[PDB]
Design a protein around this ligand. Sequence first.
Ligand SMILES: *[C@H](C)[C@H]1/C(=C/c2[nH]c(/C=C3N=C(/C=C4\NC(=O)C(CC)=C4C)C(C)=C\3CCC(=O)O)c(CCC(=O)O)c2C)NC(=O)[C@@H]1C
Ligand SMILES: *[C@H](C)[C@H]1/C(=C/c2[nH]c(/C=C3N=C(/C=C4\NC(=O)C(CC)=C4C)C(C)=C\3CCC(=O)O)c(CCC(=O)O)c2C)NC(=O)[C@@H]1C
Ligand SMILES: *[C@H](C)[C@H]1/C(=C/c2[nH]c(/C=C3N=C(/C=C4\NC(=O)C(CC)=C4C)C(C)=C\3CCC(=O)O)c(CCC(=O)O)c2C)NC(=O)[C@@H]1C
Ligand SMILES: *[C@H](C)[C@H]1/C(=C/c2[nH]c(/C=C3N=C(/C=C4\NC(=O)C(CC)=C4C)C(C)=C\3CCC(=O)O)c(CCC(=O)O)c2C)NC(=O)[C@@H]1C
Ligand SMILES: *[C@H](C)[C@H]1/C(=C/c2[nH]c(/C=C3N=C(/C=C4\NC(=O)C(CC)=C4C)C(C)=C\3CCC(=O)O)c(CCC(=O)O)c2C)NC(=O)[C@@H]1C
Ligand SMILES: *[C@H](C)[C@H]1/C(=C/c2[nH]c(/C=C3N=C(/C=C4\NC(=O)C(CC)=C4C)C(C)=C\3CCC(=O)O)c(CCC(=O)O)c2C)NC(=O)[C@@H]1C
Ligand SMILES: *[C@H](C)[C@H]1/C(=C/c2[nH]c(/C=C3N=C(/C=C4\NC(=O)C(CC)=C4C)C(C)=C\3CCC(=O)O)c(CCC(=O)O)c2C)NC(=O)[C@@H]1C
Ligand SMILES: *[C@H](C)[C@H]1/C(=C/c2[nH]c(/C=C3N=C(/C=C4\NC(=O)C(CC)=C4C)C(C)=C\3CCC(=O)O)c(CCC(=O)O)c2C)NC(=O)[C@@H]1C
Ligand SMILES: *[C@H](C)[C@H]1/C(=C/c2[nH]c(/C=C3N=C(/C=C4\NC(=O)C(CC)=C4C)C(C)=C\3CCC(=O)O)c(CCC(=O)O)c2C)NC(=O)[C@@H]1C
Ligand SMILES: *[C@H](C)[C@H]1/C(=C/c2[nH]c(/C=C3N=C(/C=C4\NC(=O)C(CC)=C4C)C(C)=C\3CCC(=O)O)c(CCC(=O)O)c2C)NC(=O)[C@@H]1C
Ligand SMILES: *[C@H](C)[C@H]1/C(=C/c2[nH]c(/C=C3N=C(/C=C4\NC(=O)C(CC)=C4C)C(C)=C\3CCC(=O)O)c(CCC(=O)O)c2C)NC(=O)[C@@H]1C
Ligand SMILES: *[C@H](C)[C@H]1/C(=C/c2[nH]c(/C=C3N=C(/C=C4\NC(=O)C(CC)=C4C)C(C)=C\3CCC(=O)O)c(CCC(=O)O)c2C)NC(=O)[C@@H]1C
Lengths: 162, 162, 162, 162, 172, 172, 172, 73, 273
Amino acid sequence: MKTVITEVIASADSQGRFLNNTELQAANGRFQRATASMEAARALTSNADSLVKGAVQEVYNKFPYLTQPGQMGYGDTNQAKCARDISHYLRFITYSLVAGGTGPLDDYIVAGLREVNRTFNLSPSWYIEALKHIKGKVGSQLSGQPLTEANAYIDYCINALS
Amino acid sequence: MKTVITEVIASADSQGRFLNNTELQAANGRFQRATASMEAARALTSNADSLVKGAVQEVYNKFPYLTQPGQMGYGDTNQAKCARDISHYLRFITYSLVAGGTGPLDDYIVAGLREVNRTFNLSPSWYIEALKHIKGKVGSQLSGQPLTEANAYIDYCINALS
Amino acid sequence: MKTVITEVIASADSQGRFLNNTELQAANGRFQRATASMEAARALTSNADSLVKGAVQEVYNKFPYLTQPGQMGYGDTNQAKCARDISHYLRFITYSLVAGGTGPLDDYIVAGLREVNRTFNLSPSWYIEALKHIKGKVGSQLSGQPLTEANAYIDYCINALS
Amino acid sequence: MKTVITEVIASADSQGRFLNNTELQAANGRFQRATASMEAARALTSNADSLVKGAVQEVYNKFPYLTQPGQMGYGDTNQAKCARDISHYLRFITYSLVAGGTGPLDDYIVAGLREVNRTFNLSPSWYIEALKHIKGKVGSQLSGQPLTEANAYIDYCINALS
Amino acid sequence: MQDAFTKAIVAADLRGSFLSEQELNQLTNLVKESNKRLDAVNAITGNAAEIISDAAHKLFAEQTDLIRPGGNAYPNRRMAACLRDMEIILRYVSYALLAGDASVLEDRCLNGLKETYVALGTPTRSVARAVQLMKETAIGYVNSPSGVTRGDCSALVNEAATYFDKAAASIA
Amino acid sequence: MQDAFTKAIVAADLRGSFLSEQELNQLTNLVKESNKRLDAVNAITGNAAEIISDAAHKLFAEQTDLIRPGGNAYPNRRMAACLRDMEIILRYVSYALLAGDASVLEDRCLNGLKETYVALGTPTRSVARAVQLMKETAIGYVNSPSGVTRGDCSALVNEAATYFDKAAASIA
Amino acid sequence: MQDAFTKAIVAADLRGSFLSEQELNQLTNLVKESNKRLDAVNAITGNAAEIISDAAHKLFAEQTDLIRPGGNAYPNRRMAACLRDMEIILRYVSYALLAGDASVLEDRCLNGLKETYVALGTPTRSVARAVQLMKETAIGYVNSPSGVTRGDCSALVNEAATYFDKAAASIA
Amino acid sequence: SVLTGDNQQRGSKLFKITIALSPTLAHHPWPGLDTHEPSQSSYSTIVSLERLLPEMTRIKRNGGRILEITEGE
Amino acid sequence: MNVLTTSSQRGGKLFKVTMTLSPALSHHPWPSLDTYEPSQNSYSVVVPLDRLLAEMTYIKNKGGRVLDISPADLEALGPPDISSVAIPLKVELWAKADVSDVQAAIVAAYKQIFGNTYVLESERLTSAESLLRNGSISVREFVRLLAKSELYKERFFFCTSNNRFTELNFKHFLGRAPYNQSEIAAHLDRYQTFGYDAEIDSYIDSDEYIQAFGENVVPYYRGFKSQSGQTVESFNRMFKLYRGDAGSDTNLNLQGQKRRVDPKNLLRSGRGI
Ligand SMILES: *[C@H](C)[C@H]1/C(=C/c2[nH]c(/C=C3N=C(/C=C4\NC(=O)C(CC)=C4C)C(C)=C\3CCC(=O)O)c(CCC(=O)O)c2C)NC(=O)[C@@H]1C
Ligand SMILES: *[C@H](C)[C@H]1/C(=C/c2[nH]c(/C=C3N=C(/C=C4\NC(=O)C(CC)=C4C)C(C)=C\3CCC(=O)O)c(CCC(=O)O)c2C)NC(=O)[C@@H]1C
Ligand SMILES: *[C@H](C)[C@H]1/C(=C/c2[nH]c(/C=C3N=C(/C=C4\NC(=O)C(CC)=C4C)C(C)=C\3CCC(=O)O)c(CCC(=O)O)c2C)NC(=O)[C@@H]1C
Ligand SMILES: *[C@H](C)[C@H]1/C(=C/c2[nH]c(/C=C3N=C(/C=C4\NC(=O)C(CC)=C4C)C(C)=C\3CCC(=O)O)c(CCC(=O)O)c2C)NC(=O)[C@@H]1C
Ligand SMILES: *[C@H](C)[C@H]1/C(=C/c2[nH]c(/C=C3N=C(/C=C4\NC(=O)C(CC)=C4C)C(C)=C\3CCC(=O)O)c(CCC(=O)O)c2C)NC(=O)[C@@H]1C
Ligand SMILES: *[C@H](C)[C@H]1/C(=C/c2[nH]c(/C=C3N=C(/C=C4\NC(=O)C(CC)=C4C)C(C)=C\3CCC(=O)O)c(CCC(=O)O)c2C)NC(=O)[C@@H]1C
Ligand SMILES: *[C@H](C)[C@H]1/C(=C/c2[nH]c(/C=C3N=C(/C=C4\NC(=O)C(CC)=C4C)C(C)=C\3CCC(=O)O)c(CCC(=O)O)c2C)NC(=O)[C@@H]1C
Ligand SMILES: *[C@H](C)[C@H]1/C(=C/c2[nH]c(/C=C3N=C(/C=C4\NC(=O)C(CC)=C4C)C(C)=C\3CCC(=O)O)c(CCC(=O)O)c2C)NC(=O)[C@@H]1C
Ligand SMILES: *[C@H](C)[C@H]1/C(=C/c2[nH]c(/C=C3N=C(/C=C4\NC(=O)C(CC)=C4C)C(C)=C\3CCC(=O)O)c(CCC(=O)O)c2C)NC(=O)[C@@H]1C
Ligand SMILES: *[C@H](C)[C@H]1/C(=C/c2[nH]c(/C=C3N=C(/C=C4\NC(=O)C(CC)=C4C)C(C)=C\3CCC(=O)O)c(CCC(=O)O)c2C)NC(=O)[C@@H]1C
Ligand SMILES: *[C@H](C)[C@H]1/C(=C/c2[nH]c(/C=C3N=C(/C=C4\NC(=O)C(CC)=C4C)C(C)=C\3CCC(=O)O)c(CCC(=O)O)c2C)NC(=O)[C@@H]1C
Ligand SMILES: *[C@H](C)[C@H]1/C(=C/c2[nH]c(/C=C3N=C(/C=C4\NC(=O)C(CC)=C4C)C(C)=C\3CCC(=O)O)c(CCC(=O)O)c2C)NC(=O)[C@@H]1C
């Protein structure tokens, strides 16, 4: 799993050398940032649910036809799944904030994203809206660096999805 | 040349991916530290000379026989060289403080150190004393993080020499 | 380009051996089949246009919202593209029938399919319908082996798209 | 272990070929030489001790300060070690004469020489003197080819040490 | 490799000298801008996908023939390459932007690129065009973000430009 | 790989849940110690060469036979290896110390080590001994540094110990 | 590799004899079926994507836990593998079907698979289940095509089954 | 081959794989028909999960079959 | 082209200059728009040092542009001797290899894997070497480790282009040079999605690697002798990729990392993509 700390270890390890000043400087960076990161996570974790409702909802407004019978958005099972999924995205994001790296995101969400989505005919677009809608809401509860961090990670997914 | 910034680029580049939040965190670390580092360099740069005199000198006290005729410490040419050399070590150290990485040290001083020293019969020991003596003096002009940084780099060489 | 003939040559060539009976048998297969294949191509080539119209159309019935303003199906440029694209699929299929291999399809259409589609947000689904609708029409103008051949190739794409 | 005999076998073996005239010629060379080599070994083996005493001693004359307290040459343990070590060098040399190759030397003495010496701060210089002093003494007890052989091996170490 | 700091070092080294006080003050101030610098990079990386997507659309609207049978972006396989390339160039540019130095970009990405295009028959001019199209879009984001403390980024913006342009030029 | 943070995550993941507030507070405080943590590491790395050198001397004073013909540390070639190994183990330990987690140490370094030693005929006992000798020397530095703000490092010191000990045990 | 023809040969070889007239008549008959045989294969390959897609849906509707955190099909990465595997097995089965021989399937694909699955903690039962789900869907197509000359494919259908089953068994 | 430490630098779960060796997989650089080594007719290697699929497929196409798979730890 | 004399009758170091010709620089004595002879799109002249400045200014003041300048002495030098690479030599690492044999392999591996390029004591990898010689790692696996190592990346992959890195790779991992534009294209795409490790993996994993020096044989130079499925031109490309003994792949030299094999030459052997 890719976090700042793991990477410097890895790099040190490859060359076969002790952790010298170079790497510690880097580590220090991760730790200083953490305070902001951690704050952001507390904020998302608390409002989770509400964010999720809002998102799922949005998607339907954006793509009305999904809710029509014979479509994917239709019938509760699907809605349940849709909810579940977004929850996940969120969950991971929090994780990544705390871990101080994209690692958690990469391994859970991103790796294999495409093929899963292809085989089950999930349109990336949907997810994206979810995220965007979220991003917008988060853009109220947070501010300054905490905010900035939240965005970074949220986006990271947008880019991976697209 | 290995600095924090170059490394993360390198790592990013190898994997073939954009610089994401992970790396920037690291970079940030380097920049925050710099203020201390830079301070230390200004301090060494100013007292350079005095540090050098003191060191060279020390070495002779530590190894009297060097100054006897037919030895290495003997005759001005050699003394001049001895001075020059230590100056270099210092010079590089400053560089490394500012560059925020061991890079400068590695490429100038360390790589090939052994063989040079072997072929010309320079005893690592000597250099080491020089450094130690220095470290001791620096341990007055500096304080707090600035100091800490200075040490790190000075040591890094001790270890490479030994 | 992968056709029966090219492959056996390739295989022969790798091993470093002359074309022996093994390969010729295979070649013979390709040539016997051709008569049916060729027939199929003449049939598609003639009705091309009509097939295309029908398909494009279908897609819109299947996905009404595409034709609404602010969507992809909307505004002539896009419609033109949509047409163009399907034409291509067809064109290639004919080619492949005649060449007696998937080769033409693979190299023009399939290779890079995913990424193109991702970057421009073309939904595979659409294409698929087009094809299916086609397949259904073709299932009238043709019969017996000629038909069978036509299908094979058409499908091959469906699978590649999905 | 590298001796003439082992090498030709090795080379023959690699190619997968019987020992032909080429190699035997080489072998013949060795074994012809042996008579001289063997003689040399008998001479060193006998005077061993005396050579060792003389050497150790020499080193101290050459580097008086070693015998001062707080140095390496000081206190019996160290002297004992110093003796032991030189014995070894000698021992191996004899071996190599008899084996008719550097093999024995390479594997015992030379491989890892540097790092050992670095980590324990043994100065190559010392050993060298030991050897030189030896070489000088040997230059009396022996003569002609026997001598020549003795030198070769002794030197081989000098070069490895330096 | 190289970057702003390392570079200044190297210069100093050949003179054989400790760093000039003047020279330190370059680096001192360079540090101060860091935060700005970072955000700039962050903006590109965050929007990457889009930047490209966008540029492409515009590239193909202009040079219709690229996407016509017999053109260089046809068929799919080729198109894919063209997209891939754009991305790469961008990726590097970003790297440079962080380093505060063209080098990385010049050595890894640009050097020898032009020749490849010509031998393949890929039209260098069009490539260059794409690079610019990218440039403009990218700056767009760098310069208009949300939730950042408002201030002056110009200095960075221009340096960004230059990188893009070195690219455009050497390819072209 | 793993480290303190990542680990907690993973646990949380299997439960399928957001991180408990309680759990955050572990990490929150872990951060606060960082500075201490870092200095600890810095101390080891700074003294590395010495730590080893020292330990070795003591190891060989005790087990004279290792350095006698027929022993395991003789001749030079072997000796060299033995030194190298010690160092490696140390290197890893440090890594762990920074991560705040044994894993890295266990997985890259300790895993299979015993068996190797066995196959070679290296006496595992002695190896373990060396590791301890190292431990004590290392702590020595961690705990007595220069220019560091005075305060309590115990917590870190003990964790350090544990790492050394996991090593000793699994080798032995 | 091996297949129906080659196999019979090999047997004959060890006896040291020309092929039995009886044995020829196996092969003679086998030829006659070819056309049927081919269409069967064609049907699978044509529907491949679907077969899988379908089976998967059903697999996950049944064993909900596989897709829950802590299950084996979670997270994405794993899911992907699981899909990929199913497909592979299918691919091989088809191969066999053409050859007229299990071998290829057994040797390249099935051999060692159980143990792998075990080591990973993949639940072999579920894998087997999937294979069957696939089987039924596949037969579905083989057995109900359009524009093929109507006749009896049973013989082939059963052989198909067997292949699927060998798979199911050896995995399970 | 017993792993002395995690062979691979890049990290994932590692699995020891024991294979019966075809002459092709490890041909000796010898004139005539190449012979795999007598001492090991059953090479055992340590592999990362990611590499595990490629390694097995390459083993498969070459004569030799997987004797056993064991998790490397 | 070949230059026949190193120096002018009056002492003077000749220098071969290569330009792209322009209609102004040379034109047919024909009616209608002036055309340079097509065959001389890239013209070459050998000029003494004295006239070099004037010659070059004139070329550039017309639409000419200078492709490259090179001393005549380096030019008009023998094509490198293939003596050492005609028969590579080959190293096998037996099981139960004694201390020396393991050393030889290691050296040989560093030689082939890194080019002549020198590896310093600090650069050298103890860990990887450690593993070899107590078993556990194949020669093949060591080779993978070296190409993974930063040392490798810093020289070959981080300085030059991915285009250059591919053929650089081909030569080190396989004696062969690259055949065809396709190989170069495939590797580039692999690198973009899978990344650096997967690309490195794909040469060692490839069957061509397995078929020759598959396991426990240090890679040797297959190119310079006739190989199956190898385009004839590849053999010529091997002379461009491999310049003499005591010629290396060096980031260090001025503009260190460039392409030995021109893109056009690759296109000749095969096109399609
Ligand atoms: C929401 C925007 C839309 C929606 C979603 C939806 N998803 C599925 C099925 C799956 N979705 C996922 C996604 C994940 N599962 C994971 O484990 C992870 C990583 C943590 C992700 C991102 C997966 C794997 C599936 C496949 C099977 C499964 O869910 O177990 C469906 C069902 C489609 C089907 O064919 O079964 C739906 C509908 N639901 C909506 O209403 C929106 C349109
Ligand atoms: C000082 C502790 C002792 C001393 C030094 C001394 N040095 C040399 C010769 C060399 N010194 C170096 C060192 C460096 N040169 C470099 O380029 C670098 C990196 C920037 C270093 C660290 C070198 C390379 C040489 C060899 C070549 C040269 O002449 O420069 C000597 C002369 C020995 C000789 O035979 O050349 C001496 C004496 N002088 C003393 O008296 C101290 C004991
Ligand atoms: C029809 C089902 C829908 C539709 C299609 C549409 N396509 C594009 C753009 C492209 N489509 C392709 C497809 C091909 N072009 C090729 O050369 C090949 C291989 C031979 C294929 C399969 C490509 C490559 C493009 C991208 C380049 C381009 O500009 O054409 C668009 C325009 C996308 C845009 O963002 O402008 C559209 C709309 N149009 C419809 O009405 C349907 C929804
Ligand atoms: C004699 C000129 C000086 C001296 C020697 C001395 N040696 C050591 C320690 C070691 N010496 C060796 C050398 C060898 N041991 C071997 O097995 C071989 C190869 C066969 C050699 C050449 C080694 C390995 C050591 C390390 C520990 C050990 O003694 O085994 C010392 C002790 C230094 C210390 O503090 O460790 C000394 C003093 N003694 C003198 O009086 C001269 C200066
Ligand atoms: C898109 C903006 C334009 C375009 C691009 C294009 N490129 C290729 C093929 C290749 N491009 C490269 C270039 C690179 N190699 C590197 O290492 C780097 C970074 C330093 C780059 C950017 C290479 C090597 C190839 C050949 C191999 C491959 O295709 O992967 C094509 C395909 C053409 C062909 O015949 O291969 C295209 C289309 N051309 C356009 O049409 C756009 C204007
Ligand atoms: C320039 C294109 C835009 C802009 C930038 C801007 N940023 C700041 C200040 C900060 N921005 C950051 C961002 C980071 N610092 C880090 O360590 C990282 C990596 C994790 C990032 C992304 C931070 C922390 C600061 C300091 C606090 C803050 O956000 O204000 C400023 C303020 C002035 C200055 O830094 O000197 C500015 C101006 N503003 C613009 O006009 C553009 C929108
Ligand atoms: C020193 C305290 C003791 C000692 C060490 C010693 N080790 C070897 C040989 C090896 N030791 C290792 C060590 C590692 N393998 C790994 O995977 C790791 C962790 C990642 C390590 C640290 C290995 C690989 C070997 C074998 C090959 C090698 O070159 O080291 C020896 C030499 C054994 C021989 O007979 O050649 C020795 C001596 N032995 C002692 O005497 C001390 C008690
Ligand atoms: C513990 C073994 C000993 C000890 C440690 C100690 N350190 C601090 C505080 C700091 N230590 C550092 C060091 C670094 N931070 C970095 O980013 C880097 C890498 C470049 C290093 C090396 C820093 C910056 C701090 C903060 C400022 C300061 O130095 O005080 C403390 C103070 C308490 C705290 O947690 O901050 C302590 C106690 N002190 C001892 O007495 C132990 C022997
Ligand atoms: C899906 C129906 C079920 C399932 C599959 C699943 N497999 C893995 C991982 C692997 N599965 C294989 C299988 C193969 N390797 C081969 O060589 C072949 C064909 C020759 C097969 C069939 C292998 C080797 C792996 C491990 C390495 C790899 O993925 O390439 C997983 C993930 C296991 C993990 O922890 O990574 C899964 C999920 N398991 C289920 O949950 C389904 C019931
Ligand atoms: C069996 C599952 C179903 C079925 C099969 C069936 N097929 C035929 C006859 C033929 N089918 C083919 C197919 C091919 N021959 C080829 O060379 C290729 C590859 C290019 C294919 C796809 C052919 C050529 C024939 C012969 C002519 C014809 O189809 O009319 C039969 C007829 C009996 C026979 O053995 O010829 C049958 C029964 N039909 C069903 O309804 C089954 C469910
Ligand atoms: C016309 C059908 C196509 C076309 C032609 C074209 N050619 C040029 C430029 C040159 N063409 C030549 C050709 C020759 N020079 C020779 O001496 C001979 C016979 C011995 C030939 C056939 C040359 C050498 C040039 C370049 C220098 C010159 O002008 O003589 C151009 C103009 C290129 C420019 O940018 O200058 C063109 C347009 N190109 C087309 O557009 C048509 C498809
Ligand atoms: C010393 C007398 C002068 C000098 C030498 C110098 N050489 C290099 C670099 C290399 N030189 C070689 C040499 C050889 N390669 C071979 O294989 C052989 C014969 C088999 C030889 C003699 C090579 C391969 C290199 C390149 C690889 C590398 O540099 O690592 C340098 C370093 C160049 C640099 O800028 O780093 C130097 C300094 N230069 C002097 O100053 C002396 C006049």
